[PDB]
């Protein structure tokens, strides 16, 4: 159930920029926000009806298209007080702080956001 951002900490979460994707804080202007809608029985992110999260490997990110599967749509799921996201590879999708968004196996804080909305 979500319409905006994931956060990596008090630091910053992962949102929209222009014709690119970053991470940061409300402040200047409006926030450029995400849409998490569902899929089979899972979940998908989209924001312009052409962008579905994406990833590639090692520690590269990126968006693709709308999709039934997982790794461009996500299994993304509360935790406690946080929240994680998970494509194939059984990895989840990672945060570092400010070591900028990766992807790992692991599951504790280093890659689980807290669910910021509107």
Known sequence: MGNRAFKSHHGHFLSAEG???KTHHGHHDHHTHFHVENHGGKVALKTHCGKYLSIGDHKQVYLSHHLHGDHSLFH???HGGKVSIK???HHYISADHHGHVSTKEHHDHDTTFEEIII
Request: hydrophobic content about 35%; cysteine-free; aromatic content about 0%.
């Open 19 to 21: 014709e690119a994707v």
């Open 76 to 78: 993304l799921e509360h």
């Open 87 to 89: 494509g194939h590879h």
